[PDB]
Design an enzyme around this catalytic site. Structure first.
Site, PDB file in Angstrom:
ATOM      1  N   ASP A 521     -49.851 102.829 -23.221  1.00 38.98           N
ATOM      2  CA  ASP A 521     -50.766 103.555 -23.158  1.00 38.98           C
ATOM      3  C   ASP A 521     -51.154 105.255 -23.254  1.00 38.98           C
ATOM      4  O   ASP A 521     -50.369 105.251 -22.020  1.00 38.98           O
ATOM      5  CB  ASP A 521     -52.131 103.355 -23.210  1.00 38.98           C
ATOM      6  CG  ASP A 521     -52.666 104.206 -23.158  1.00 38.98           C
ATOM      7  OD1 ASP A 521     -53.225 104.453 -22.981  1.00 38.98           O
ATOM      8  OD2 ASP A 521     -53.555 103.774 -24.991  1.00 38.98           O
ATOM      9  N   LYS A 615     -63.779 114.256 -15.625  1.00 37.67           N
ATOM     10  CA  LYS A 615     -63.022 113.454 -16.839  1.00 37.67           C
ATOM     11  C   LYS A 615     -63.349 113.412 -17.461  1.00 37.67           C
ATOM     12  O   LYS A 615     -62.689 113.675 -19.350  1.00 37.67           O
ATOM     13  CB  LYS A 615     -63.629 111.961 -16.028  1.00 37.67           C
ATOM     14  CG  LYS A 615     -62.252 111.399 -16.731  1.00 37.67           C
ATOM     15  CD  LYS A 615     -63.479 109.198 -16.688  1.00 37.67           C
ATOM     16  CE  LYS A 615     -61.986 108.865 -17.065  1.00 37.67           C
ATOM     17  NZ  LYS A 615     -62.563 106.982 -17.089  1.00 37.67           N
ATOM     18  N   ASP A 785     -53.114 104.716 -29.311  1.00 39.62           N
ATOM     19  CA  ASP A 785     -52.832 105.383 -28.066  1.00 39.62           C
ATOM     20  C   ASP A 785     -51.840 104.317 -27.592  1.00 39.62           C
ATOM     21  O   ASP A 785     -50.499 104.751 -26.892  1.00 39.62           O
ATOM     22  CB  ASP A 785     -53.529 106.692 -27.464  1.00 39.62           C
ATOM     23  CG  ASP A 785     -54.859 107.275 -27.829  1.00 39.62           C
ATOM     24  OD1 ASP A 785     -54.438 107.312 -29.455  1.00 39.62           O
ATOM     25  OD2 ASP A 785     -55.215 107.937 -27.132  1.00 39.62           O
TER      26      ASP A 785
END
Length: 856
Positions: A521, A615, A785
């Site tokens: 990923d 984040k 992804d």
DNA sequence: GAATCGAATCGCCGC
RNA sequence: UGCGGCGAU
DNA sequence: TCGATTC
């Protein structure tokens, strides 16, 4: 009222049709065709039952107008109902003498709000209430009018700025009684402030409300034949009553529409045979000629779909068909664990035994309210996934049909899919496996570390952590109920899936046949692709595009950067100053202190900033979030959780800390990933210039019409961005609200995120064909992804996903190709305003080939 | 001109 | 459609 | 916060 059953004639056809069954029988035998066609028949069977239960529930609660069957009727009925009540006001105004009782009550409420309230409450009373008398529905119409009239003045006139803070709170409440109670409470608060002019609502008397509804029922009758007046036992003073009956034609129209939609909505299930290859736009995936056909591109408009039939995109068609050809089987071992722990716990992982106060309680009360909604909504998805996993557990292999959205990202059509949550991901493994070998066992161990959350640590230490915890992995695989360690992990059901495959390779050696999906990923796909277009070195290193000494955390890099600003501001920051602030609605002038950067730096350093503070802000950058969006994020994610926990005593004024942190994060992300900020700005300005209509203010006529945005991705897929907005919309406070110009704001808001999402879809599709043809990979796990395959194929997929990106951006500069499409569409006055293409950086694409931590 | 507003995709469930 | 919740990226 | 739309 009584819905036709589409299943008796239409649904039987998809099983007995001559040509779909033979084309399935020639490829995979006739007996597999019978099972598949019955499964697709059950898929349409279950979807019709879903619509019928929802319809019956909407029938009981009077929500029939919310159903899509009643929408076309109301859309044509409404223009005559609004005109009739507008004309009746003009007749009464021309009329002399006493105005009617209902005339004064009708004017204050919006006349279009009357028309929907009458139609919805009449059909609600006729369908559910079992009373057809005029006075009961008329009282219901009048009470619904009064409820909108009493609390509408909050939205309309006196609190039109104050509503925008109570509107979100009102929308959070569900149910008209819950929505009303908060609307009563907000009225009491507003009346205490004097905002509504100090005039309390005078409650309508019961006799007054009936007169409101009666006139509205008659005005509907003159406008449309929705109801016909009936008089029973006339001439008898005791038994005289008047009833209205719904039009048989109109009730037939909703039932015919309801039967049509019941056949249009299926519950998609996995295929027991390999899916039908996508030869064209329609008919792919499921084999049967059905009422709802699968589309290659999920488009809201059928015109956008029709643009894809002329274009020839051979590589796009192959990549979907290879992805469909990947065979999956239900992992029975995790299913046996999941079947027992789900009966004991709502979520098996949610709890494991291990080693302004009023506003705070109000937010705490809202926390337990949403959690109760969350824990119910999370479970009902789990019960469906488990049933789907248990149903297909015994099958030797299942296949998932694949289609894609208008941008290009591929998704699995079936409701049970490998693109689901951790449990659904763990319940599915690939069907065709190969002997694991030394390389596959290495990559299986790496996949075990990623399921454990050891992804931030480089590859040799990921191997070490698995070998250190070898005895715990074997113990969990020996009896998952006896050891809860796998549940404590970040991806528990997928980690337990690794534990079973790890235990098999110890018992059976490296000759063990492992069919487990091994997911690679990418860390941040939007920034990886944006750094690849413009060759930004420091961005690519931040997203691990470049080889690095260790795995690089972009959140940690930004957190380090904001920390440097925090320490510098703690020495040389601005001092606090008092600033006048005026609340406009009150008019009150007050003098509050403004915290300087020196004081705000001291607060945040006292909290301690980590990757967690930054984040979410980094993730939403690819979606278009900036300094303003970050301000809301840091408040809800760090500051507000702190003050509930007793921390945040440092944040004396929370909003100043949020704005200070949002500025620091935005300065840090702009210098950390320079290409991402510049590329998104170039796309947004390009869409803005294309969106806006061009006219000289003195000429009136438009020199250039509002234009949509189109680009072609490297693997041949075209994508058109045509965001379109309705001209008029209707909104009611207590009731559900009920060609076209291009919405310029949505065109600018979505151009940059969709463009990079078109690039990652082309990268995923190019990776599939490259891994299928250059290497021998036939099984693929694809979640936008994430790229997954069997462990024996894991090394080549690791090479293939890097090779496709380095070839794609060396072959084409997609931003430069994009400029070629719209340059001729641009008006000559806009040409000077258009920014130049962003500068290309120093990053070398060939370094991506040797980057361990890109994963993609 | 002043006024005012905004601040990715795909599914599932509910209203 | 919108609104509320969940998940995927 | 600010360049927008938006009246």
């Amino acid at each position: 009222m009584n819905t036709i059953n589409i299943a008796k004639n239409d649904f039987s056809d998809i099983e007995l049709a001559a040509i779909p069954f033979n084309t399935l029988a020639d490829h995979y035998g006739e007996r597999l065709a019978r099972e598949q066609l019955a499964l697709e028949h059950e898929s349409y069977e279950m979807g019709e039952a879903r619509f019928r239960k929802m319809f019956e529930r909407q029938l009981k609660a009077g929500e029939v107008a919310d159903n899509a069957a009643a929408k076309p009727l109301i859309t044509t009925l409404l223009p005559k109902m609004i005109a009739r009540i507008n004309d009746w006001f003009e007749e009464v105004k021309a009329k002399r003498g006493k105005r009617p009782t209902a005339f004064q009550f009708l004017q204050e409420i919006k006349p279009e709000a009357v028309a929907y309230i009458t139609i919805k409450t009449t059909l609600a009373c006729l369908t559910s209430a079992d009373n057809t008398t005029v006075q009961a529905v008329a009282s219901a119409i009048g009470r619904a009018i009064e409820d909108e009239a009493r609390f509408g003045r909050i939205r309309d006139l006196e609190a039109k700025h104050f509503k925008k803070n109570v509107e979100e709170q009102l929308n959070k409440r569900v149910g008209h009684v819950y929505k009303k109670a908060f609307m009563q409470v907000v009225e009491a608060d507003m009346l205490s402030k004097g905002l509504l002019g100090g005039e309390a609502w005078s409650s309508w008397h019961k006799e007054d409300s009936i007169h409101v509804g009666v006139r509205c029922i008659e005005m509907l009758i003159e406008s449309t034949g929705m109801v016909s007046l009936h008089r029973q036992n006339a001439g008898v003073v005791g038994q005289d009553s008047e009833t209205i009956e719904l039009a048989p034609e109109y009730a037939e129209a909703i039932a015919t529409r309801a039967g049509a939609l019941a056949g249009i909505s299926p519950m998609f299930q996995p295929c027991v045979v390999p899916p039908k290859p996508w030869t064209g736009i329609t008919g792919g995936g499921y084999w049967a000629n059905g009422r709802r056909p699968l589309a290659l591109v999920r488009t809201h408009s059928k015109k956008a779909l029709m643009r894809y039939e002329d274009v020839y995109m051979p590589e796009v068609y192959k990549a979907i068909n290879i992805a469909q050809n990947t065979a999956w089987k239900i992992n029975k071992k995790v299913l046996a664990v999941a079947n027992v722990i789900t009966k004991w716990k709502h979520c098996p992982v949610e709890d494991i035994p291990a080693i302004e106060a009023l506003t705070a309680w109000k937010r705490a009360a809202a926390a337990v309210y949403r959690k109760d909604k969350a824990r119910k909504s999370r479970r009902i998805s789990l019960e469906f996934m488990l049933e789907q996993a248990n149903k297909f557990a015994n099958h030797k292999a299942i296949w998932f049909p694949y289609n894609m959205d208008w941008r290009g990202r591929v998704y699995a059509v079936s409701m049970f899919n490998p693109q689901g949550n951790d449990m659904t991901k763990g319940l599915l493994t690939l069907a065709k496996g190969k002997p694991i070998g030394k390389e596959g066992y290495y990559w299986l161990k790496i996949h075990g570390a990623n399921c454990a959350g050891v992804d931030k640590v480089p590859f040799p230490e990921r191997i070490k952590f698995i070998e250190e915890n070898h005895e715990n992995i074997m113990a969990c695989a020996k009896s998952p109920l006896e050891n809860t360690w796998w549940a404590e992990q970040d991806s528990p059901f997928c980690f337990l899936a690794f534990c079973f495959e790890y235990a098999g390779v110890q018992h059976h050696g490296l000759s063990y046949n492992c069919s487990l999906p091994l997911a690679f990923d990418g860390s941040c796909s939007g920034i990886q692709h944006f750094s690849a277009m413009l060759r930004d070195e420091v961005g690519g290193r931040a997203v691990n595009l470049l080889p690095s000494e260790t795995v690089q955390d972009i959140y940690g890099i930004v957190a380090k950067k904001v920390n440097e600003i925090l320490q510098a501001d703690a020495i040389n920051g601005t001092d606090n100053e008092v600033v006048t602030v005026t609340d406009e609605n009150t008019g009150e002038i007050s003098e509050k202190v403004k915290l300087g950067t020196k004081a705000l730096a001291g607060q945040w350093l006292a909290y301690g900033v980590t990757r967690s503070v930054t984040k979410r802000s980094v993730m939403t950058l690819a979606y278009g979030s900036k300094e303003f969006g970050f301000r809301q994020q840091v408040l809800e994610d760090t500051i507000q959780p702190a003050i509930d926990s007793g921390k945040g005593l440092m944040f004396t004024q929370p909003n100043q800390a949020a704005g200070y942190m949002a500025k620091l994060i935005w300065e840090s992300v702009s210098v950390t990933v320079v290409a991402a900020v510049e590329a998104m700005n170039w796309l947004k300005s390009a869409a803005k210039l294309l969106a806006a209509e061009v006219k000289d203010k003195k000429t009136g006529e438009i020199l250039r019409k509002r234009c949509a945005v189109h680009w072609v991705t490297p693997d041949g897929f075209p994508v058109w961005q045509e965001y379109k907005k309705p001209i008029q919309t209707r909104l009611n406070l207590m009731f559900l609200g009920q060609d076209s110009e291009i919405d310029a704001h949505k065109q600018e808001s979505g151009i940059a995120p969709n463009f990079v999402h078109s690039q990652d879809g082309s990268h995923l599709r190019k990776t599939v064909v490259w891994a299928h043809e250059k290497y021998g990979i036939e099984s693929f796990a694809l979640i936008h992804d994430s790229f997954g395959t069997i462990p024996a194929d894991a090394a080549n997929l690791f090479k293939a996903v890097r090779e496709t990106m380095v070839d794609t951006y060396e072959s084409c500069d997609v931003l430069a190709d994009f400029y070629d499409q719209f340059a001729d569409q641009l008006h000559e006055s806009q040409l000077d305003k258009m920014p130049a293409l962003p500068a290309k950086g120093n990053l070398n694409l060939r370094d991506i080939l040797e980057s361990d931590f890109a994963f993609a």
